[PDB]
Amino acid sequence: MVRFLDGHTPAYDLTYNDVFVVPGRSDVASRFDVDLSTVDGSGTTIPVVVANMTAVAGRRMAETVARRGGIVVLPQDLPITAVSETVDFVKSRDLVVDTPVTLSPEDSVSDANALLHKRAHGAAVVVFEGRPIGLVTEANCAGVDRFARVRDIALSDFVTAPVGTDPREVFDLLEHAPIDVAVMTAPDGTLAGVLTRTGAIRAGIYTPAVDAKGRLRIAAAVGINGDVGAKAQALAEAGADLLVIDTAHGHQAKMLDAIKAVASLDLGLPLVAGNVVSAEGTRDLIEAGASIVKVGVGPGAMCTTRMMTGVGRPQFSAVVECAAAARQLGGHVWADGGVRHPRDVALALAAGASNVMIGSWFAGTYESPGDLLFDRDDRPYKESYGMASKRAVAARTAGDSSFDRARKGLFEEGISTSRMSLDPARGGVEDLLDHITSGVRSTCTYVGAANLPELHEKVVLGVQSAAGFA
Amino acid sequence: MVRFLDGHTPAYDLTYNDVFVVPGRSDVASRFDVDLSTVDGSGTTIPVVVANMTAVAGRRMAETVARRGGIVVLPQDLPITAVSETVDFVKSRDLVVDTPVTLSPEDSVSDANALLHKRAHGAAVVVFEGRPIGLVTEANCAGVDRFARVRDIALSDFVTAPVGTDPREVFDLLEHAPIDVAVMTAPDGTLAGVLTRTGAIRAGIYTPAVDAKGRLRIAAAVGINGDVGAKAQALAEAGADLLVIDTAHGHQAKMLDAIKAVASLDLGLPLVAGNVVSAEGTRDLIEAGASIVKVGVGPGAMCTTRMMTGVGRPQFSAVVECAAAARQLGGHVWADGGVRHPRDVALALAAGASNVMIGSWFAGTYESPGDLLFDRDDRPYKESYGMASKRAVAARTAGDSSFDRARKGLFEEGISTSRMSLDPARGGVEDLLDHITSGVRSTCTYVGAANLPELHEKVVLGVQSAAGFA
Amino acid sequence: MVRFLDGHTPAYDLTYNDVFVVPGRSDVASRFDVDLSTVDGSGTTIPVVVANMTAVAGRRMAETVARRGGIVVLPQDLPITAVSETVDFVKSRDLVVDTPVTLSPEDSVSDANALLHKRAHGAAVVVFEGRPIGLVTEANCAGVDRFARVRDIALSDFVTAPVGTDPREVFDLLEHAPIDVAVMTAPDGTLAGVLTRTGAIRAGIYTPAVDAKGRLRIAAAVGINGDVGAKAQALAEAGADLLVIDTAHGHQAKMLDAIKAVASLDLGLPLVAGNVVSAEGTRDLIEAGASIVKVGVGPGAMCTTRMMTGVGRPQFSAVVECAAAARQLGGHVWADGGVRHPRDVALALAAGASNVMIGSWFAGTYESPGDLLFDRDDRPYKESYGMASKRAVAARTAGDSSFDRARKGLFEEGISTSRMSLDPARGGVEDLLDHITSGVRSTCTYVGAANLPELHEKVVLGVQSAAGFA
Amino acid sequence: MVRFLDGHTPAYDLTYNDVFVVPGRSDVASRFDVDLSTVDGSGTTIPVVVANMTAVAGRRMAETVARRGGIVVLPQDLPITAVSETVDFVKSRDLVVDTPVTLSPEDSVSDANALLHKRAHGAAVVVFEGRPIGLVTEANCAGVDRFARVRDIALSDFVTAPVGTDPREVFDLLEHAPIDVAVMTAPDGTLAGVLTRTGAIRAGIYTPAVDAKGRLRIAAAVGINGDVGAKAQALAEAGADLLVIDTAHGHQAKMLDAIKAVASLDLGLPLVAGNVVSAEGTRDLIEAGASIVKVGVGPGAMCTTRMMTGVGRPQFSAVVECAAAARQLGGHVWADGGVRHPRDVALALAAGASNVMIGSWFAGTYESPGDLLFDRDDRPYKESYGMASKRAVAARTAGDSSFDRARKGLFEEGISTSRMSLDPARGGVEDLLDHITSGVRSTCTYVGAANLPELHEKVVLGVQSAAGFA
C-alpha cells in the first residue's frame, strides 16, 4: 500500500503531475546495485513492455527490446504465418551479438543508403558468398553517384573478432578504431553479426529476457471477436510466450467470455487482459481467469477519448486502486497510460504496477517498422498511426459488404497520425531504454530500495497543488 | 441522482473540465444497440436541439436537423408571415429524400457556383419544365467563363431512381457511379429530390422526428415583452410544435407573468423557459406553468457575461441542481451551456438533462443561413452574430424615437462577431451530428446503458484537479 | 455579510477569478431603475473614484469625471498654488455643458491638430473676441500645409443654441447635422461651451456630484511625511472636498500619527487612509480618526510588490474582511485593487466596499494629462508612470544632498512605464464610465437589487476551481 | 513556528507560488533600520550565500560577494593548490577599495577590451612600474585599430585619492568628474585600487564579512567520496572558514560516514551537509555532527530531477519542516531551492532558514568566471553549466579505465547548458545583491521586524489558489 504524508487526503483523483516521491533513508550506494527484474511471470528483466501497435511492434523492435530484457507484443491482426515467421526470426537471434544490416556488392548505392537507417549501428557490412568483405558508412556512400554500386564503395579495413570473446575485449579493440563497429564471425569465418562499442557495455548492463530454452521472448495479442480460442491456440503453437487479450473497454461480457474461452484451453501461458480503471473490473477479469490486468482508459485530460466521450480516469489513482485489488487476489497489473517521461514509469512502479506499457514514444526510433521521413528542416521523423490504419480496415475488409463497412465506418473518426521526431542523441531505442532505466534506478536509490518490490513497499508520496506549474 | 466516487466532495462548483465518467460493467455490445430517444415530450429522437440564433436557425437548418431526429427553434423576432412560410416549407419536405439545389438552364454560371455551397451535396440538378436534365459540379462550372450559362455545362449522365426504393439499393447503384448523388423522381417523372450515398446510410441510422401527422417538427421562440399571449397563439396557429420563452435572465417577474399568460391559453404544446441556474428558479418556472426549464447563465469563466458582471455558474453543477429540482416536480431541463465538444453533450446528459441546446457551433456549416466567406488563405468561414444584429435593432426600430433608441443603446456593447471556420471533413451539419451522436453512443456503451434514462441512472463520476491540464 | 453556497468553504484566500455571483429572484425591470449612489459621505453618485496618479489625475480628468458623478483625487506632490488653480477651474465649470477646446484664428494648424486630441469631442471651436466663428475637425486641418493657419480652415456652418435649453432639444437639433457638436452660448452671445450628441443623453443618465454650493467636487491627497496637519489645512482652505492620506503600507506608527494630526484640526471633511489588508489595520485606522479605509496591498499574484517581497493579499478576501471590520465600527472601505474589468468593480461592491479606486486603466484616455503617442502601427497609446517619475524625484529634490538622494535611490527599482493603448471605440473616459456602470447595473438587475446597499445585502456567491480556466 | 491564517490548512505541500505574507503592524520607519545579520555561525551579514558551482564560484566572485557581506563556496573538485591560491588572494584584498583591472602600456588594445568586461567598473587603469598613468574606457579603445597598443590610448586625466579617506569625500570628488572611477593610492604612491561612485555608497550600506583576523571570509566544499577527512583537513589548513559536504542525496550511509569522519577531526569550523527534504534526514545529519543542514531536492515541478525520477518536494514545506526539526536540536538550515526572485529569499527566511543559497542566477554577471558571449542581437550572455562539465569528467578522469568511465557514463544525461542573459541595468553582481537585499528589507518593514529572528517570529502567512495565476 502506497503511504502518503500526513494530512494529504485530496478530494479528487491524482495524475502523475499531482504527486511526488519523498526521499527516504538509503543504503543503495550506486544505481548498478538495483535489480529491476519483474515478478509478474512475464520473464522481463526490465519493467518496460512494448505496446502492440503496428507502428511500433516490429521484428527489429522485438529483437532489440528482448535482447536488453524487455518484451514486445505483436499486433492482433498480423496473419498467423507472419507471426510464426517473426517468432522464428526472433528466437534464432544471438543473445549478445546484434543482427547487422547486410548488403551484396551488386545492390544500388541508393538502396544501401535507404537500408542504413534501419539500425542504430550507422554502418553496413558487405557480404559475399557468406563472408564479410568491407564496411560502408553514410558519409562514404553519400559522396558518390546516384547510380553507383556497393562494390567500389566498401572499405576492407574493419575490426573483426570470433564469436564468444569477452565484450570487454571487443571494447578494448574498438578504442582506437576509426569505426565503432566490430564484426563478430563464427569459427567457420562466416558473418555472425556486429557489436557496437556501446553494445559491449550494454551487454554487461542488461540481462536478456529468455525462455526455458534460452531463446528471446516474444508475446502476441488476440482480438475479442471471432474464435478467440482457436486464435490463442494457434499463437501458442507458433511459440508466443505470452498472450494479451486487448480491447478499448475491458469489463464487458465479451471480454469475460473471451478470457474464459482462452483459460479453458489451459495453455499455461500468462494471460493479459484490459483495459479497466476500477477495482471491480480488475476483480472480474482476474476471476474470469486472467493473470495480468492491463490498466488505463482515457488517461489524459485532453486526450481523444475524453474529448469525445468524457470517459476516463487519472492514471495514478486508477493504477493504485487496480494494483491493490489485484494483489488482494494475487494478480498483477500493467500500466498502459501512455508514458512520455521516465517519471511516469517510476511513478507507475511506485503505485504498484509490475510492468509498464510503452507505445507511441518508441515510434520515433530506427528499429520501428515505419520508414524514415524528413521535415522541411530535414529533421528525421516518423508517422505514428499512419499506414497502420490499413491493417484496421483489413479487419473490416474480411467482414461484410461495402454497405456494412460504410455503415460501421460512419461513427469513426479520422486517423490520428502524429509526427514523432527522432532524437539525434537518442535515435536508437536502446538509448531510450537507457534513459528510462536510469530514471527508474535513480528513483530506487532515492527511496532506498534494492528492487521493485522494495520500491513499492518503502515509497512515500506527497501531493502538490497546480500553482507550482505556473 | 448522479453518484460520485467516495471522498469526492469538492468545496466549489464543477465545470465540464472538473469531472470524468468512470466505466462500469457493460452489456452493450455495439453503439447501434443504444436508443437515443428523449422523454421530455419534445419528440426528438436525438438529444440535440438547435438554438434560436439568427445566424444558425435557418429553414435549411430546420429541414436537415429535423430529418435526422433533431429540432430547430426559430428566432423570436422573425415576422409571423415568414414563420408560417418556413413552417409550411419544412412540413412539406420528404422524410427520406433531401431537397436539392435546382437550377434552370438560363441562370448564370456564377450564380450556380454561389448556390452550390448552400447544401452539402456538392452538386446541383438542372431542371427544365419540372424535369431533371443533368448534373453540375463545382469543378465543372469552375473551368468556364464568368459569363457562361448553365445550359452548356450540365452533363446528362447521372443515376436516377423512383421514390420509395430501398436506400440500400440506392447505395448499391451509387457504388461505381462517378458522382455520389442519385436523383429520386416521382412516378410522374418530375424531380422529387436527391440522395447522397452517405444519406442512404444516415436514413437507416437516424429516425426522423415527426408530429402526429407524420411531418417534420419545428419550434418557435417568443420574447418576454409585448403581448406574449397573442404571439404564442399566432405561432401555435402557424403550426409550431413547441414554444420557447427566452430571456437572458429567467426567474424574474416578467418571465413569471409571460409563462402564466401563455399557459392560460392552454395551447397544449410543451413550453420551454429560461435561463436559470438555481433550484429555486427552476421551481418557480415550473410552478408558473413551464414544462421544460432551459439552464445556463454565463457558463464560461472568461465569457462576456462574467467579464462584464461577474454573474454566472459553472454548467455541470447548475445542470445537476436544476435537473434534480425539476425531476422533483416531474419537469425536464435543457442544457444551454454553449457546447463545443461531444464531451459536453455526454456530460450534460449524464448530469440529468433531457436535451442539449447547440448554438454557434453549428454556425460554421453549409446549412446555416449565413453566406460563405473566405479568409486570406481561402479557408471557408462564416460570421457568427454578424448581420443578425440588424434583427436585434429591428426590435428597437419598432420602438420609440431615435432618442430612446440611442438612450437604450448607450449601455450596450458592440457586436461579438466570431469567425466560425468550416471543417473540410465536416462541412455539413450532418457530419457534426454524426460526431456528437458517436460520442454519446460511446459514452452509453462505456457506462453500460441502453438508453438515456439508464445513462442518468447508472453513471458514476469522479473529480480531477487542474494539475492534469498542465 | 456576503453569503456563500452550502459547502463552499475554501482553505485559501479568494481572488476575483475564484468567485461568481449566483442570480437571484429579481423585480428590477431595467438597468435604469438602479440607483448607484454611494453612502460613504464622499458625495459620488457612481461608485467610481479616480486614483491620485500623476499620469491620470488631471484637471480635464477631474472636470469630466465629476460631471458624470465620479470624483478625482489630486496627487500629493502637486504644489499648493497648482492645487488651488485646479480646484478653482473645476469649480467654475458648468454642470451640463462641457468645456471645449478653443482656438484663436492666428494659431498654427499644427498646434490645432495637437490640441484636437485633448478632448473626446473631436472638433474645436474657433473664437474671436470671445465669439465663436467656426468649427474645425481633424479631417479639415489634416489636408492642409504644415504652416497654414486656423483662419482659412474653419467652417462657419455649425449648430448653435442658448445655454439652458433642454438637452433633448439639442439631441433633436443634431440629428441631421453634419457635425455631432452643438455650440451652447450665453445670452450675451459669448462662447459658453459645447454639447456632443452623446453628451445630451449622458446628461440625462448621470447626475453630477456637487457640493453644498452646487459646484463640482474634487479631492486631494497628502503624504505621511513632513507637517501633515499644515498640508491638510492648506488643502482644505483651497477647497478640496475630501482628503486622502496615502502610503504603500498603512497600519504603521507614522500613519497613526498623521491621521491623529489631521483629525485634531477638525476640518469636517471625510478622511481616507490606506492601504491595509487586515481587520486589525482597519480597526486601528478607524480608531485613529479615519472615516474611510483604502484597501489593497500587492493584489496580483505576479505584481511587482509580490515578486519583490512576497507581501500582499488576494483582493476579494481582503475587501470582505476589511469591509466587515469597518462596518462593525460604522466606517467604510474603498477597494484599491487595480480594476481592469467591470467584473472587478461589481465584485468589490458585492464584497462590501462603498467605492472603487480606478488607476492606470483610465491612463489610456484623451482626458488624461499625458500626451498622445503613436506606435509603429500608428495605434494611439500613452505611457503610464512615465514623466511622473520626475514628480517623485521632486520629493527627493527638496530633500538632502545628492549623497543622500543616491543613497536612498540605491534600494529603488526602475520606472514601471506601461503602454496603455487607447480603445478606438472607447477613446474617451466617458465611454469607460459607461462600460463600468453598465456592468454594475447588469449585476444589480441579476441580483435583484435596486441600489448598492441591497446589492451587498442580497448577493449570493459561489467558488470555482482553476480548471475552468483551461 | 510559522503562523497561518485561520482555516488555511491545505491537503498538499506548498511552493513559493502558494503562499503570501500578510502585513502586520510595523514600527520600522525605513529599510535602513533593518539588520540583516545571520546567526547560523557562518559570519555573513547578509543572508545571501553563493553556491559552489564552477560557472559561478570564482575568485572575483568570492572577493566581490565577501566585501558586501556574503560568502562564496569553492567547488569541491578544485585542486588544493588552486584553493590555497584563491584563499590567499581573497584574504589579501582590501575591505573597502575594490581590486581593479590593470594593464601595462604594452598590451594589445584587443586584450584590454577583452579584460574590460571582467569587472563592473567599466574602466581599466594603466600601470607603469607600479604607478598609475591613465584610465582607459570601452569607448576609447573601441575607436582604434585592432593592432593598436594601450600606450597611445590612455588618458591621464583621472581623479585620485589616498587610501583611508572618507568614502563620502570620494563621492563628493566624483560628482562632476567625467569618469565615475576614482583611483585610490597608498601613501607610497603605488596603485592600491579603485572606487566607483556607487561603491562609496555601498561601503556605507554593507558591512564586510570578516574573520577574527579581519580578512574576507571564504568557504570550500568536499565530496562524499575518497578520504573526506584528509580533504577537510587540507582545506581547513588552507584557510577556508567553512566546510560544505555536498551530494545530490543526503540522508544516506555515505553521508553519515563522511560527516562523522569530518567531525572527528574537531576542526572547529561550521559544517554544512545536504541535501535533505525531510525532518528525519535533518535529525540524522545533525546527530552525525553537522551544524548546518542544506535543504532542497528537485524543487521545481518541471525540473530535470523530477522529470527524470519523480523525486522531490516543494521548497516551502520542506524548508518549514526541516527548519523546525533543526531548531528542535539547535541547528540551522540553508535553503537551496534555486532562487530566481527576491520573493524566494524573503519567503525562505520567513519559513525559518538562516541563509539562502543562490546558484545559476549569479552566473549572468561580470564577476562570474565564465567568459562573455554575445547573441545574434549582440546581447551579452553566459553559458551556465558549460565548460564546467570538464571538471566533472575530471573526477572521472582520475578514476578507472576508459571502460569504467564509459560504463558509468552510460546512465548520465547531456550537459544542461543554459543561456543566462546579463541585465544591462544589473550587469554587476552588486546590483543583484542590492535587488535581493531591497526585497528582504521591504519584507521586514512590511512585517514589522527589525531583524531576521523577528521576521521568523512575527510573520503571518496565507495560502492562495492557482486561479489567481490565470
From Swiss-Prot, chains A, B, C, D:
Residues 96-153, 154-212 form the CBS domain. Its cofactor is a monovalent cation. Disruption phenotype: Knocked out mutant does not require any purine supplement for the growth and does not exhibit any growth defects in media containing hypoxanthine, guanine and adenine. NADP(+) binds at residues 246-248, 296-298. Pfam families: CBS, IMPDH. Optimum pH is 7.4-7.8. The active site is at residue 303. Keywords: Allosteric enzyme, CBS domain, NADP, Oxidoreductase, Purine salvage, Repeat. It is an enzyme of class 1 (oxidoreductase). Activity is allosterically regulated by the ATP/GTP ratio in a pH-dependent manner. At pH 7.8, GTP has only a minor positive effect and ATP only a minor negative effect on the activity, however, at lower pH values, the effects of ATP and GTP increase. ATP-dependent inhibition can be restored by increasing GTP concentration. IMP and XMP are competitive inhibitors. PROSITE patterns: CBS (PS51371). GO terms for cellular component: cytosol. Activity is highest with Rb(+), followed by K(+), NH4(+) and Cs(+). Its EC number is 1.7.1.7. Homooctamer composed of two tetramers. The oligomerization state is regulated by ligands and pH. Belongs to the IMPDH/GMPR family. GuaB1 subfamily. Involved in the purine-salvage pathway. Catalyzes the NADPH-dependent conversion of GMP to IMP. Is not essential for viability, but may contribute to the regulation of the purine nucleotide pool by recycling GMP to IMP. This is GMP reductase. The lineage of its organism: Bacteria, Bacillati, Actinomycetota, Actinomycetes, Mycobacteriales.
